[PDB]
RNA sequence: AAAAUUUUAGGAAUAGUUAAUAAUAAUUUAUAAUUUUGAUUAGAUUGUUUUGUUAAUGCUAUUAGAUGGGUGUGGAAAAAUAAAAAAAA
């Protein structure tokens, strides 16, 4: 019963005829603040105390990614997974945004200050 | 009489099966079941592996 | 026989709502005032959302910024030019009105126009009521009906509350599909039918055990509100915990699947193990979806020319008698194995937000200033609340008469502030401050009725609704035998009728005035 | 139907059926008896006394 | 005194044999080792 | 935990381009069924012993069967209920509408009862009277208990027992006997080759003992007859 | 009289265009004769046929009127669009 | 059962339901294992010596 | 060939009659 | 201080009038009843 | 006896096809003869047969299937109980010109069978839907049956569990109550239907004229436990009507009882000994007229009140879509 | 009952340049046309109609 | 109230049933009745020189518009659209 509503519906059904496109959607991220030498992480693994912004971080999540600033270029490396996420002195299932937390990535990886850890999702 | 009655009932069941029309070919049945002889025979008793 | 003025919750959804009541000039003027206020402040067309309820809507660009929503002046009216382009897209599959951030303003506007229709036609008076209350959004609606908040301000207030809820959900890592609500009925759950008190005790034990068993992961489950004495409890959580709770609330699962004699802890352990087994096997998530739409084809090659352009019959009786593929809730064979299946005791809800949950503590803290800077300063609030003047307002949290100067009410509100959900787990990494508690402490140290009211309003955003206690206090303490509940769909008047009060049971006559005005 | 199957336009009418069939009064009954009305008198053979 | 159980069960039992793998208390495997 | 196996779901692609998705429960066809446990604790099977079908071998169910199920015929209330139900059954048989009965020998029904559509016409009344015969043979000694005069002391003891337990009065006993006599006089007479029972069954009953008992009760009471 | 099956006794039929394509005439004739796909609903049943498109290519037509033909050159079609 | 038929006129001379030909010994040879020899002797057509 | 297929063994073992022990 | 009846020319251009169904028969209530009791609202 | 057909899979496929396409006789015969010849009928097979029987509203066949299932030791389930109750509720009934449609259903205690099925479904732990309760109530309140007391008990337990009332069940129960002369119960049912919002009953709301009156069971219990005084409470007064001395009151009440009995003893000509609710009341399940319903909502999609007459869906000298068409 | 002489009325309503007229008047040898409902300009690159 | 005439490419069983009766309103009796000489159910169709055509006893048409629950009224239901119709000076 509305002209622009009908136009929007027509545009939606015209766009829906195009084939699917894969979009990497990032749910949340954290910015590294300090990095500590962790014994349990491994010789090549370093723990990181960092502040998480724009959403919470799930330790049980599967797909993670690392972003490093090179030069205002942002390169992406280490599509892996979080090994041990702990806040204060106790393990946590998830940490909400704004709260500082300590993260340890798997595969014995170490990251410096300024790194950005991002949890993402692939879907059609 | 028991056997004759059983045969008559089987003939009636064939007449009823005639309702389904022509039967499909082999590959439908062949792909219907992925069961193997192992799962078929384990129901009664587990046979030892050959030596 | 004193009427209790009850307001429906945000759960009600209708395209029509109260469009037919705009024929009265006064109701039309009020509706135009509210719609113009909302359009000038955020470019949102409530009339369009109600009458059309589209799937895609365009509002003012950069009008959904959380910083501006939080720090803007609620009382001040926006003077945005009508030529401002509307480039912000809001899209929902079911409809725009399904979105909470816009559902709340529409529901509040419908309540206001219905009340205005009653007042103009029948001379209905709110002051005749001796107690006023509402479910969730009904609290704000009741305050606006009293007059402490003008409708123009209140529409913006509820829109900002909804926007903060949406921001909290977006900040939550779990997607919108991972947040579901269910209504549980322990009586039909056959959990100690002899004692409904033991039934609700077993329900609480079940949810606590599930929360403890799943505290390692990000799964959560907690009781959100208590609607009926033993017939309706609304709880939210992730699909895994909800399926575990559904399996617990199933006599067959407790009979043959595990035990028939085992303790509640063993039952919960078997339930979570079975849920994990279902995940391993591949049971579909959210199986409560409806069947496939009516099939009409036009490809004669695949189905024949005689079947083209015609709907296929759903069996010999056209679906009148459901088949085994549609009675999955009775045959626990496939698509009904998971606990998410509707079974008349574990009812799904269409709402996709964990209202009154631990996930909304941050939203509550951000929303406290929003109601702090929206109330009148010190005159009308104190006149209304003080000693108290009828109608008395009941709060969702620890439902009691709002008596800010009473030590008993102060202790009840402090217990509500410092309380916790039944299945809540505040481990490390969970947002937790005490801004509302400190605000109420300041409101107890110095009078600050406005600050106390703001704190108690903000608390219910992330604290459970004690509607059972509200009903008990309305019937017994305030001597109410009649309920005038305004709702398009009779959301809570049905529960009011269903529940029985023992005082020889007091008779409660309840009605929806805009819907059954003839009976009034 | 179990007896006859309809697959084309069917003839209608009793005396309009082609080929035509009509009564033929001239027979043994008309040769023997003077019938006051058609079919008043008949001659036949008894084919049952069960009743 | 009590009415007898319906003798029509003979018709149901007619041309029926107890399945080895469909007994109420039959397991897999049918025969267990000692 | 006795988990029920799931159906095998197969998707097949027709050469015309159609798709068929069907779930065949091939697993739960040879494997033994997975029985469930009742919520109440023990499974309660539905009872179907009261339904009336075209089962020729089975007798027609009657309300007297429900009272005979308990077997506590000593109870006076149970005896009264038995008498009321038996009288109702006999009266229903006597006043049955016999418009379209048409009970005649049919050749095709040699090895089975009457046709399914002919149950009410040519089978119902015969089954009803056979059920009446069976119920009477079962409950005659309960409705009309045997009397024993013995000597004078035996008669005194019998009268004392009767006064202690006057379960059924002479009037209602006589009404029951009258309805039974009417049914016996209007019994089914014609036998069929399909009748598996004895041919002597379709004959009127002998109620000499019942007449003696009702006469004993009538003389026991002070005035059984009135000028009305 | 098996011809004109889709006319259903009427001397003409009211059809709607769906597709248009070309077919080779029967040998020894050679060419690309134009034939159109037509759809029509009769007594709540849809029917699809193929008819020779001899109408002039002028206005943008969506419906067509179909009559009988008789030219044995095209195997499968016997219906012709009225001019 | 020929000795105790549950129907009258076991045989018939219709066009599509002739059963007299289906009563000869050749058809009973198939079920000769279950056959009753007295019934075969009394009710059969074209029996051999 | 369909008869030879292994599902026939499943059918046979499923329809195998139970044998009562001698009294 | 009557109602038209729809006509359809069936054969030989002969009109056929579909008069409203009698209010007493069960077919009107059959149409009024819901189609799928489990799914649709009562 | 080809191996393609001598297998449970093909038997189940054909059984499903017959249950979804043909009538109940096909499924019954096929299931019984397969069971006789060697096919084992599991819970799925029995549920398919019961679905077909419930869809066609067969009672005796449902009872026979239940007996066979119990003999074969197949445990029922929620779908089985739902199908049993639905079949018992869909059993055809009524009177057509002083001719009873289904008189065998009188002796086939389908109401009791459905009640036992519902009780078993609740006890075993399955979720009994509202359709089962409505069908169970209909089995009690169909025109040939008068069990309004048990119907009231079932409806009270339904309201306590907060079930939903079907318009058909409400109509049948109201007809039964009016036939059995229960105006108070009929008014209560109408008020409940108006309050719930049943389709067609949104306007049949009436004031309670028995608001202060006690129940008949209450007055009977009071009499069992002065009956002369209790007669005044039993008889309703209009306020402006006042009691008379009890000696004359007893005579007046006896006169009224005699007059009422004499009035109700008079035969009604042409009524065939049937109530007005039982006159011209033939009910069959919707499977009988599904084709009519489908073609009505096609030929007269926008004229629901129009009669579906032939020549709307077929020309002259041509067959119509529905073979049976109106009735048989 | 069948309505003929409808395209004749639609001829007066379809104004502008006729598709067949444009096809006939296009003397360019480079361009190509195909006829489905009108003479649409075929795209050599893809084979579809030239937008 | 009777008799004759009575449709379908792939043809089979039908049934408030037949007769007798001191029986209105059948508690009975019978080896009952229908049908391959084409029944019953289902489809089509207003039955008995009226149209068209031909050398034709062929082929092809046709609104004689006719019937159980709505009132037991009326001599008789057909009684709730119409249809050229004079109904008590
Ligand atoms: Mg004939």
Automatic annotation (TrEMBL), chain A:
<protein>
    <recommendedName>
        <fullName>Translation initiation factor IF-2, chloroplastic</fullName>
    </recommendedName>
</protein>
<comment type="function">
    <text>One of the essential components for the initiation of protein synthesis. Protects formylmethionyl-tRNA from spontaneous hydrolysis and promotes its binding to the 30S ribosomal subunits. Also involved in the hydrolysis of GTP during the formation of the 70S ribosomal complex.</text>
</comment>
<comment type="similarity">
    <text>Belongs to the TRAFAC class translation factor GTPase superfamily. Classic translation factor GTPase family. IF-2 subfamily.</text>
</comment>
TrEMBL record, chain H:
<protein>
    <recommendedName>
        <fullName>Pentacotripeptide-repeat region of PRORP domain-containing protein</fullName>
    </recommendedName>
</protein>
TrEMBL record, chain I:
<protein>
    <submittedName>
        <fullName>Uncharacterized protein</fullName>
    </submittedName>
</protein>
TrEMBL record, chain L:
<protein>
    <recommendedName>
        <fullName>Trichohyalin</fullName>
    </recommendedName>
</protein>
């Amino acid at each position: 019963n509305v002209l622009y509503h009908g136009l929007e519906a027509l545009k939606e059904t015209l766009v829906g005829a195009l084939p699917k496109i894969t979009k990497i959607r990032v749910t949340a991220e954290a910015e590294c603040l300090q990095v500590f030498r962790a014994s349990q992480a491994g010789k090549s693994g370093n723990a990181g105390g960092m502040r998480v912004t724009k959403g919470t971080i799930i330790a049980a999540h599967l797909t993670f990614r690392v972003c490093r600033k090179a030069p205002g270029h942002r390169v992406v490396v280490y599509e892996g997974q979080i090994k041990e996420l702990r806040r204060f002195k106790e393990l946590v299932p998830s940490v909400e945004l704004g709260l500082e937390c300590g993260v340890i990535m798997q595969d014995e990886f170490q990251f410096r200050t300024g790194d950005i850890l991002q949890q993402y999702e692939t879907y059609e | 009489t028991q056997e004759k009655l059983a045969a008559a009932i089987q003939e009636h069941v064939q007449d009823a099966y005639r309702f389904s029309g022509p039967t499909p070919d082999q590959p439908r049945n062949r792909l219907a079941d992925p069961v193997t002889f192992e799962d078929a025979n384990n129901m009664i008793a587990p046979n030892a592996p050959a030596a | 026989l004193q009427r209790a003025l009850v307001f429906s919750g945000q759960g009600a959804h209708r395209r029509g709502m109260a469009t037919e009541y705009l024929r009265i000039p006064a109701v039309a003027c009020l509706w135009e005032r509210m719609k113009g206020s909302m359009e000038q402040k955020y470019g949102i067309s409530l009339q369009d959302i109600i009458t059309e309820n589209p799937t895609r809507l365009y509002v003012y660009n950069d009008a959904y910024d959380v910083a501006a929503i939080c720090e803007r002046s609620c009382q001040d009216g926006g003077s945005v030019v009508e030529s401002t382009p509307k480039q912000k897209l809001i899209s929902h599959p079911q409809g725009v009105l399904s979105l909470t951030s816009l559902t709340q303003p529409c529901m509040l506007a419908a309540h206001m126009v219905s009340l205005e229709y009653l007042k103009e036609t029948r001379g209905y008076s709110v002051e005749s009521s001796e107690v006023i209350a509402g479910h969730s959004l009904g609290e704000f609606s009741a305050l606006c009906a009293l007059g402490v908040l003008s409708p123009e301000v209140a529409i913006d207030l509820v829109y900002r509350r909804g926007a903060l809820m949406e921001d909290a959900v977006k900040h939550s890592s779990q997607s919108n599909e991972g947040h579901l609500m269910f209504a549980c009925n322990p009586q039909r759950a056959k959990l100690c039918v002899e004692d409904p008190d033991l039934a609700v005790d077993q329900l609480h034990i079940f949810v606590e055990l599930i929360a403890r068993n799943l505290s390692t992961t990000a799964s959560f489950i907690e009781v959100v509100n208590y609607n009926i004495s033993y017939e309706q409890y609304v709880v939210v959580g992730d699909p895994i915990a909800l399926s575990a709770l559904g399996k617990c609330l199933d006599p067959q699962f407790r009979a043959t699947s595990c035990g028939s004699s085992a303790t509640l802890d063993n039952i919960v352990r078997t339930a979570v193990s079975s849920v994990l087994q279902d995940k391993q096997e591949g049971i579909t998530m959210n199986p409560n979806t409806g069947p496939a739409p009516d099939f009409v084809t036009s490809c004669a090659r695949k189905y024949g020319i005689r079947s083209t352009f015609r709907r296929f019959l759903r069996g010999p009786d056209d679906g009148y008698t459901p088949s085994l593929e549609e009675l999955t809730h009775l045959t626990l064979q496939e698509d009904g194995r998971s606990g998410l299946k509707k079974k008349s005791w574990f009812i799904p809800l269409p709402l996709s937000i964990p209202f009154h949950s631990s996930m909304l503590r941050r939203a509550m803290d951000l929303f406290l200033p929003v109601v702090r800077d929206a109330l009148p300063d010190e005159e009308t609030m104190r006149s209304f609340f003080c000693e108290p003047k009828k109608p008395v307002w009941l709060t969702n949290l620890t439902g009691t008469a709002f008596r800010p100067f009473d030590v008993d009410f102060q202790r009840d509100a402090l217990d509500a502030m410092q309380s916790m959900n039944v299945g809540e787990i505040r481990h490390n990494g969970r947002y937790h401050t005490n801004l509302v508690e400190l605000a109420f402490k300041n409101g107890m140290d110095t009078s600050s009725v406005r600050d106390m009211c703001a704190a108690v309003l903000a608390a219910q955003l992330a604290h459970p609704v004690q509607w059972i206690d509200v009903m008990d206090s309305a019937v017994f303490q305030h001597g109410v035998r009649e309920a005038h509940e305004i709702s398009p769909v009779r959301t809570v008047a049905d529960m009011f009728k269903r529940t029985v009060f023992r005082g020889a049971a007091l008779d409660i006559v309840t009605r929806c005035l805009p819907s059954e005005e003839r009976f009034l | 139907n179990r007896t006859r199957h309809h697959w084309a336009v069917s003839m209608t009418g009793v005396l309009s059926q082609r080929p035509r069939r009509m009564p033929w009064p001239y027979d043994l009954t008309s040769l023997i008896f003077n019938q006051p009305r058609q079919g008043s008198d008949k001659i036949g053979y008894v084919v049952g006394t069960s009743m | 005194f009590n009415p007898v159980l319906p003798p029509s069960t003979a018709r149901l039992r007619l041309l029926t044999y107890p399945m080895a793998l469909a007994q109420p208390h039959a397991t897999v495997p049918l025969i267990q080792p000692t | 935990p006795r988990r029920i196996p799931g159906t095998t779901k197969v998707t097949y692609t027709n050469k015309k381009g159609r798709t068929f998705s069907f779930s065949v429960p091939v697993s739960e066809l040879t494997h033994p069924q997975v029985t469930l446990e009742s919520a109440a604790g023990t499974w309660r099977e539905m009872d179907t012993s009261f339904c009336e079908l075209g089962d020729i071998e089975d007798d027609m169910p009657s309300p007297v069967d429900e009272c005979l199920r308990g077997g506590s015929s000593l109870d006076k209330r149970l005896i009264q209920e038995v008498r009321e139900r038996f009288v109702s059954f006999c009266r229903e048989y006597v006043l049955m509408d016999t418009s379209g009965m048409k009970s005649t020998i049919l050749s095709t029904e040699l090895n089975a009862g009457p046709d399914y559509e002919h149950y009410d016409r040519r089978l119902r009344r015969k089954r009803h009277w056979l059920a009446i015969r069976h119920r009477f043979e079962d409950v005659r000694y309960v409705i009309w208990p045997d009397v024993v005069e013995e000597t004078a002391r035996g008669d005194s003891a019998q009268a004392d027992v009767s006064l202690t337990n006057p379960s059924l009065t002479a009037g209602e006993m006589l009404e029951a006997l009258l309805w039974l006599d009417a049914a016996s006089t209007f019994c089914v007479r014609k036998v069929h080759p399909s009748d598996l029972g004895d041919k002597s069954e379709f004959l009127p009953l002998d109620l000499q003992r019942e007449v003696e008992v009702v006469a004993c009760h009538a003389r026991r009471d002070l005035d059984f007859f009135d000028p009305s | 009289f098996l011809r004109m099956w889709f006319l259903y006794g009427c001397c003409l039929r009211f059809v709607l265009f769906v597709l248009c394509y070309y077919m080779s005439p029967r040998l020894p004739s050679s060419g690309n004769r134009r034939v159109l796909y037509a759809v029509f609903y009769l007594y709540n049943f849809v029917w699809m046929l193929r008819c020779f498109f001899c109408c002039f290519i002028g206005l943008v037509m969506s419906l067509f009127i179909i009559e009988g033909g008789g030219f044995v050159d095209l195997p499968g079609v016997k219906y012709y669009t009225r001019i | 059962d020929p000795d105790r038929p549950h129907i009258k006129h076991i045989y018939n001379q219709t066009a599509l339901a002739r059963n007299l030909r289906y009563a000869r010994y050749g058809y009973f040879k198939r079920d000769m294992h279950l056959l009753d020899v007295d019934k075969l002797v009394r009710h059969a057509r074209l029996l051999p010596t | 060939a369909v008869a030879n297929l292994p599902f026939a063994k499943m059918i046979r073992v499923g329809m195998l009659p139970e044998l009562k022990s001698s009294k | 201080a009557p109602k038209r009846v729809d006509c359809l020319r069936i054969h030989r251009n002969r009109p056929l009038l579909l008069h409203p169904m009698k209010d007493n028969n069960k077919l009107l209530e059959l149409s009024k009843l819901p189609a799928r009791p489990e799914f649709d609202s009562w | 006896t080809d191996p393609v057909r001598r297998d449970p899979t093909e038997f189940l496929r054909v059984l499903r096809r017959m249950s979804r396409t043909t009538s109940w006789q096909k499924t019954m015969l096929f299931a019984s003869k397969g069971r006789m010849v060697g096919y084992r009928l599991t819970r799925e097979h029995y549920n398919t047969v019961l679905f077909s029987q419930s869809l066609w509203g067969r009672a005796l066949e449902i009872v026979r299937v239940v007996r066979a299932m119990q003999e074969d030791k197949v445990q029922p389930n929620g779908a089985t109980y739902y199908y049993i109750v639905n079949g018992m509720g869909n059993a055809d009934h009524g009177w057509n010109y002083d001719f009873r449609i289904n008189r065998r259903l009188e002796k086939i205690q389908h109401w009791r069978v459905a009640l036992e099925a519902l009780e078993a479904c609740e006890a075993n732990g399955f979720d009994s839907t509202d359709t089962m309760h409505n069908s169970a109530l209909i089995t009690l309140v169909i025109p040939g049956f008068n069990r309004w007391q048990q119907a009231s008990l079932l409806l009270q337990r339904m309201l306590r569990e907060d079930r939903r009332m079907h318009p058909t069940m409400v109509k049948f129960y109201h007809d039964c109550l009016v036939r059995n002369n229960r105006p108070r119960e009929a008014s209560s049912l109408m008020r409940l239907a108006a309050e719930r919002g049943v389709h067609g009953y949104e306007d049949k709301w009436e004031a309670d004229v028995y608001k202060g009156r006690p129940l008949d069971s209450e007055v009977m219990n009071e009499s069992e436990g002065q009956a002369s005084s209790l007669a005044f409470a039993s008889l309703m007064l209009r306020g402006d009507q006042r009691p008379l001395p009890e000696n004359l009151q007893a005579l007046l009440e006896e006169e009224t009882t005699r007059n009422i009995e004499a009035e109700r003893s008079v035969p009604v000509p042409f009524s065939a000994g049937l109530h007005a609710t039982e006159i011209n009341s033939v009910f069959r399940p919707r499977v009988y007229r599904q084709l009519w319903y489908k073609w009505q909502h096609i030929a007269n999609r926008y004229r629901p009140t129009a009669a579906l007459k032939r020549r709307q869906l077929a020309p002259r000298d041509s067959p119509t879509g529905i073979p049976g068409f109106y009735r048989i | 009952q069948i309505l003929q002489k409808g395209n004749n009325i639609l001829y007066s309503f379809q104004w502008g340049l006729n598709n067949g007229t444009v096809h006939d008047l296009d003397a360019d040898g480079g361009t190509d046309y195909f006829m489905d409902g009108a003479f649409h300009v075929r795209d050599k690159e893809t084979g579809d109609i030239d937008w």
